[PDB]
Every structure is written in C-alpha cells, then in structure tokens.
C-alpha cells in the first residue's frame, strides 16, 4: 500500500531557487490544508538548501520530487500531481 | 602550491614501475624466506600475503607517496633478507593470535559500543 502519509517541503529562506515555493506557500498553502486537514504537510525550512519535496507513502516509502527553481504555479501543479492518486 | 618536487618518481608511471620490481623482489625470496626462517606456513600463503599487502595500498594516487611505500617496502625486504627479522616479526604479518573481529553491525552491537 502506498497511500499518502505525509508531504515534506524543504525550502530555503532567501535563496532565489526557492523563491517560487515561497510564492506558493503564502497563497495556496492554506487552501490545501483546508482540503486535507488530516494530511501532515511539513514545511521544515532551512538556509542554502535546494527546494525539494518528500512524499512519505505507506509501508515506509518516500519519493524525492525536487522543485528546484519551480514557480508558484509549477509548485502547485507538482502538488496536485503527487496527491492525485489517493493510494 | 599545486607543484612540489618529487622523491624518485616524476609521475604515476615510473612510480608504478618501481612498485613492479619491488613486487618482483618480494615474490622470488618468499620460498627462500620460508626456508630460511623455518616458517610453519607453506610457501603459497606467503606469496599472496605479499600480494595482499601490495593490494591494500592501491588507492594511493600520488607519486611522492608511492615512492615512500616503495622505499619502505625495500627496507622491509632488506630486513627480511639478512635475517634481521625473526620468526615472530615475520608471523606478525599473519594476524594469528587475535580473534576475528566481526564486520556485521549486529555483532558489533552485541559486543560493545564500538562504532
């Protein structure tokens, strides 16, 4: 089983490479959380880190979609792509 | 900064050259050394132990370093040839008395806090 357990977003605070995800999170993150209140979206940020997405699936599986330099629309389109499959 | 004068070898090619006949000088006398020192071990395990010692020093990629082991091995050959090392010194290469330290993580966790 690969049902969605948690989504981890690692973004840099000021790096232009992680600028796009910052544009996403101020606007669209709240609406995403209202859609999946049970889903633990993790936004553990850092400094000088390549903006990446970790998606923990059931039975201990983790995908490593990397949203480097992705714009806010790109970040959102990656998100619904990951959670499009309920399993 | 990136350039410093060498020991004997100007690059890896001649440094590797000085390794080869050192291995040659180490291959030939192993049966003679075994005969000389009344080695319990046969000739065969003598030859690959020379091979294995030469093998473990393979990651070296610096002409100055390779010269240092080359000259150091030469002294080791010299010490062995003119009966300067006794049986105990020769048997030191064969780690016999000490028990095999296991390599799996589970065994290490069972025996102690060794990382």
């Amino acid at each position: 089983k690969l049902g969605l357990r948690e989504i981890r977003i690692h973004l840099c605070q000021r790096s232009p490479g992680s600028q796009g995800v910052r544009d996403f999170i101020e606007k669209r993150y709240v609406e995403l959380k209202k859609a999946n209140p049970d889903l633990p979206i993790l936004i553990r940020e850092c400094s000088d880190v390549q903006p990446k997405l970790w998606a923990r699936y059931a039975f201990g599986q983790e995908k490593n979609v990397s949203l480097n330099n992705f714009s806010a629309d790109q970040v959102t389109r990656t998100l619904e792509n990951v959670l499009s499959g309920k399993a | 900064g990136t350039s410093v004068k060498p020991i004997f070898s100007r690059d890896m090619n001649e440094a590797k050259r000085r390794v080869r006949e050192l291995y040659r000088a180490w291959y030939r006398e192993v049966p003679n050394t075994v005969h000389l020192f009344q080695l319990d071990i046969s000739v065969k395990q003598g030859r690959d132990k020379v091979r294995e010692m030469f093998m473990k020093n393979a990651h070296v990629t610096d002409p100055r370093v390779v010269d240092l082991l080359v000259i150091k091995g030469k002294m080791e050959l010299e010490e062995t040839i003119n009966v300067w090392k006794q049986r105990t010194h020769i048997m030191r290469f064969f780690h016999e008395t000490e028990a095999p330290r296991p390599t799996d993580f589970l065994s290490k966790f069972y025996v102690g806090h060794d990382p």
Partner: protein
C-alpha cells in the same frame, strides 16, 4: 620559484598510508576541532587561544584487580594544538580523519559603567555595595 623537477601534485595530501595507523582508528574515529572554553571556576582566558584536536571517547571499564580505568583505545589521550582553524582542519583529512568543527566563541563586548550603580531613575541602581 624553485626549479627542482617540479611536477603537478594537485591531488590532496594523503599521508594516511604512511602514519602506520591501523584501519580501525582511521575511519570510525570522529575528531573534533574546537577552542576550549575557559574553566568556569577560574576567570583567566589564557587557555582559550589555541585550537584543540581530540578524538571521541571510547569504552573505559574497570579492572578485575583493584580496578583502575582500563582502556583499549590508543587515541584516547591524544590532544593536539593548532594556532588557526584552517591549519587544524587541514591536519585532519591530511591524516584522513572525519572531523566536525565548532567555531570559536568570542565573549561579546559588554558596556560597563560604574555610575550606573547609582542611577536616579533606572532600576539598575544597586541596594548594596
């Protein structure tokens, strides 16, 4: 500025194969580069000016006899001193030792005034002297 059959030796210094250290004590040891903090009991600072190199501690059991603190790690009392972090951090991997480095803690300058002890308004006025 020295013509002594100079050749390009770009690759990093790897003298580890010559120091004679056994294989165990060359990877599984994590050295620490740090400026020792002043002994809080004292107030002098003459022991916090040189970078120190030390090896992580290991098992220390008790003898079946009277019971000293036995050990089996030779790299237990080895402490090295370096005058600059760069020299210290360079000696680690040159000898081939995994390291972690802690930056020097400089006591920040604090403005101190004796007249503040007796302040007309501020609560810094002391009640005893």
């Amino acid at each position: 500025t020295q013509d002594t059959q100079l050749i390009a030796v770009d690759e990093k210094l790897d003298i580890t194969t010559l120091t004679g250290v056994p294989e165990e004590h060359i990877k599984t040891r994590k050295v620490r580069i740090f400026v020792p903090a002043r002994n809080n009991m004292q107030s002098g600072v003459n022991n916090t000016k040189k970078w120190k190199m030390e090896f992580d501690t290991r098992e220390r059991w008790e003898n079946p006899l009277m019971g000293w603190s036995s050990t089996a790690d030779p790299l237990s009392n080895l402490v090295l001193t370096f005058s600059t972090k760069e020299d210290a951090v360079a000696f680690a991997e040159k000898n081939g030792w995994s390291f972690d480095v802690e930056e020097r803690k400089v006591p920040k300058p604090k403005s101190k005034s004796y007249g503040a002890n007796f302040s007309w308004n501020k609560r810094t006025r002391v009640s005893t002297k």
